[PDB]
Amino acid sequence: KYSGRDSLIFLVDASKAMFESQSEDELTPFDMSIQCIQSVYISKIISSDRDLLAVVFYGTEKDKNSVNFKNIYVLQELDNPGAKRILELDQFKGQQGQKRFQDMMGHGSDYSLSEVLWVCANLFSDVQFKMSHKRIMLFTNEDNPHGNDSAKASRARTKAGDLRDTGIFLDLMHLKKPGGFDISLFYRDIISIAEDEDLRVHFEESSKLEDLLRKVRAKETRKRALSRLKLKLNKDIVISVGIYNLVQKALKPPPIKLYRETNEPVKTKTRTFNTSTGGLLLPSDTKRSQIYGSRQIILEKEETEELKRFDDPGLMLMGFKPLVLLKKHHYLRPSLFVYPEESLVIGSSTLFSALLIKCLEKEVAALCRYTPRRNIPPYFVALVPQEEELDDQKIQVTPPGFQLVFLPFADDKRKMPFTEKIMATPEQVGKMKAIVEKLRFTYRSDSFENPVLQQHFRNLEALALDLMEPEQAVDLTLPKVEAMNKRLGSLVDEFKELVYPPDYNPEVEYSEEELKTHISKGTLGKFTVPMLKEACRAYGLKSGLKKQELLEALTKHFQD
C-alpha cells in the first residue's frame, strides 16, 4: 500500500483517419493526443516523481515489443518520467511532426486490438515493484474499430475482460472528429472504470480530455503516520493513537550543489577544524556556551538537551472544555489530526469511538498535554471532536477523529496599542452590505495555487526542455481589478462621498592624520557606517554592526 507506485500506459491510435482531419485551425487529433500525453508527463514528473509511465503506439507500420506482434510499437517502457522522455515525444507535434512520425512509424496497417492489450499487460507484468494502480488510457478518434469482423471484436472483449480480472482498469479518452458519429459502441463493455455518464449517442465535441485540467503542476502525494503516541486518560489506562497532518506547508525541493566543470553533484564535508594548532576535536572537548554581559555560562552538550525534558512522549489528558471556550483568534500551528490505531494497544478504537461520540454529543473538546518527541517541552492541546462528513457520492471529505488545536501560551500573545473606538452609522453600513453582496464568492480550498512555486516549476520546465521562454503562470491570486470594478458599478463613488471628506486623497579616503585630528574634533559624524566598517576592516580592528561599537573602539584604541 504505502510503497506501491501508480503505473500508467498510454495507447495512441495511428490510423489513417487518426492523422488526416478537418482543414481548419483546430488541432489534428494526433497532435492533440501527443500534447495531452506530454502534459500528463509534465504533471506527473513534478508531482510524484516515482510513478511509472510508458507509451505504446498502435497501428504503426513498424513494430517493437517483447513478443513480436505486427503494427504495435512500444516507444518507451515503464520507468519514472524524465525530461529526455518528454523531448523524445515533442518531435511529433505539428505537420512537420506528423511527417516525421509517418516516415519513422507509418500509419494504416490494420491491427487486431487484442495483441496491443496483451502487450500492455506484458509491461504491467514485467515490473519488479508493487502495483498500486494499473490504468490504460486509449486515445482514439474512432468508436467502432471493428464490425466487419466479429471474431476480432470478440477476442478484444475477452482480452479486456481478462485485463479487468487481473486488475487493469482502462479508460478511453475519446477524440472527436468531423462527421456525426462517435457513438457508444464496441467500447462500452471494455471501459473497466465504467464511469457514470448520460451515454448520449450524438456527442459533438471532444470527450473527457479537457477533464485533465492540463498541467496541474504542483503536488506531492503521500500518506504516513508522522507519529505513534499514547493517550493517557490517567496514569495506568492508556490508549494508542496516531497523529496525522491534514494540511502542511509546501516548499520547493532544496537545491543541490554542483561542480561547474563536470556538472556532477559534490558531496559536502562539515567538520570542526583545528584550534590553529593542528588536529581534530572530539564531541567531548567542545562544550556549548552562552554569554550574558560579563558572565560566561559553560554547559555540556547533553545537559543542553537535558534542560528541555518534561514528560514522556504522549498525550496526557487533563479534562474537557466546552467548544465555546475555544476562541478563533488564538492560533499558532496548523491543526493536526488524531485517529485510533491498534498496533501498540489492542482495544483503543472502541474507547476512542465512545469518547468521540460522547464528546461531540456534549459539545466539548478534550484538553491534553502534548509531547511529540523525547525532549520537547509540553504544549497544551484542545482535541476538538471532528465528526465525519460525507458527500452523496460516498466520498469522505472530513474523516472522523480528533483534531489537535494548539492553544498558545501567554508568552505567545502580543499586546496591541490602545485605540479609540469609533463606530459607523446606518445608511453607509447598508452601502457596504450592498457592495459585499455585489461581490459574492463561493470560496473553496481548491481555488488558488502558490504563485512562487508555480513560477519556479515553470522555470524548471523551460530550463529542462529549452522552451526558449518560461511559461507565464496566470496568477490566480491576483484580483480581477477591472472585472470587479465594472461589476461593482458607481456605488463605490457614493461610498467615497458618503464618508471620506472631499479633501481626503486615499492614495581609501582616510589616513592617520585626519582621524588623529577628528578624535579631537570629536565628530565622527557624516562618516558613514559603510566607511567606518571599511576603515576598521582594512586596518584590522575588531568590528561589529552597531555604530556605537565602532565609535567606541576606534576612539579608545586610536589615541589610547
Binding site: 524524465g82 494540511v247 558531496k267 559536502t268 564535508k269 499558532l332 465525519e388 498558545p408 530550463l463
Partner: protein
C-alpha cells in the same frame, strides 16, 4: 511594531490600514555557541564546509567552482543563483487586496496555516479611514460572510491568501488575518469510518461510563446560572514553562 498598508477593493476604494502582530510562536533569543573545553574561548574553535569531489576525494573544490542544481525527474538540471534571481515570480510590494467575500461557514479552523495571526486594526490616529474600516467590519459582523485577502509582506516575501474575520469587542474593533492553504498545500487522506464499524461499536454501559467520566472532568462550571461559562484552569494564560 506598526505595519502600514492599504486595504483595497476594486481599484478606487482604498482604506489606510495598520496590521499589528498578534499571537505568534515565540522562541528563545539567545543561542548556544560551540566552545573548546580547554580555555573557554570561541575563537579557537573553527568550522567550515569543505566541498569534496566524489572520485578518490581531491585536494579541494573551491567555492567559486560551485553552481546550483535542481533535481527534476531522474536527472539534474543545472540552475544558477543569477538565473533564479532573474526569472522568478515578481510581485508589486506589500499588498492587502480583497479577492471577494465568502460566507463565514466555508472556512474552518482546520484549514489554517502560518505561524502567526494578524489584527488589521485601522489607519493611524486620523479618524477618516477608521470610519470606513469600522463600517466594513460592522457590515461583515451584523450580516454574515467574511473577506478573503491577498496579503504580501514585502517585495521579496511570497504573497499569501487568507481570511479576515470581523472581531468586535467592547474596547476596540478590527479584523483578524490568518493564512489559508494553497492547492498543493492541501493533503487528502482516506480513513475508515468510526461510526459504521461493528467491531468497535461501544455498548450502552461503556457509553454511560464515559459520559459520567466527561461530566466529572468538565473544566468549566455554569456558576451563578447567569449563562456565563465561568472557566476553570485555562491554558492560554500560563506562561511557557520551558523558558522559566
Amino acid at each position: 511594531i506598526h505595519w502600514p498598508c492599504r486595504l483595497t477593493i476594486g481599484s478606487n476604494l482604498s482604506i489606510r490600514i495598520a496590521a499589528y502582530k498578534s499571537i505568534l510562536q515565540e522562541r528563545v533569543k539567545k543561542t548556544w555557541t560551540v566552545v573548546d573545553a580547554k580555555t573557554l574561548k570561541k575563537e579557537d574553535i573553527q568550522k567550515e564546509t569543505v566541498y569534496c569531489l566524489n572520485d578518490d576525494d581531491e585536494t579541494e573544490v573551491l567555492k567559486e567552482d560551485i553552481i546550483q542544481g535542481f533535481r527534476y525527474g531522474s536527472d539534474i538540471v543545472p540552475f544558477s543563483k543569477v538565473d533564479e534571481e532573474q526569472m522568478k515570480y515578481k510581485s508589486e510590494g506589500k499588498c492587502f487586496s480583497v479577492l471577494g467575500f465568502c460566507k463565514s461557514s466555508q472556512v474552518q479552523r482546520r484549514f489554517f496555516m502560518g505561524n502567526q495571526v494578524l489584527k488589521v486594526f485601522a489607519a493611524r490616529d486620523d479618524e477618516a479611514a477608521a470610519v470606513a474600516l469600522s463600517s466594513l467590519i460592522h457590515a461583515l459582523d451584523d450580516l454574515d460572510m467574511v473577506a478573503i485577502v491577498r496579503y504580501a509582506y514585502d517585495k521579496r516575501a511570497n504573497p499569501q491568501v487568507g481570511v479576515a474575520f470581523p472581531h468586535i469587542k467592547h474596547n476596540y474593533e478590527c479584523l483578524v488575518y490568518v493564512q489559508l492553504p494553497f492547492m498543493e498545500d492541501l493533503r487528502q487522506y482516506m480513513f475508515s469510518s468510526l461510526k459504521n464499524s461493528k467491531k468497535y461499536a461501544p455498548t450502552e454501559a461503556q457509553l454511560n461510563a464515559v459520559d459520567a467520566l466527561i461530566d466529572s472532568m468538565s473544566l468549566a462550571k455554569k456558576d451563578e446560572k447567569t449563562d456565563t461559562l465561568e472557566d476553570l484552569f485555562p491554558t492560554t494564560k500560563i506562561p511557557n514553562p520551558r523558558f522559566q
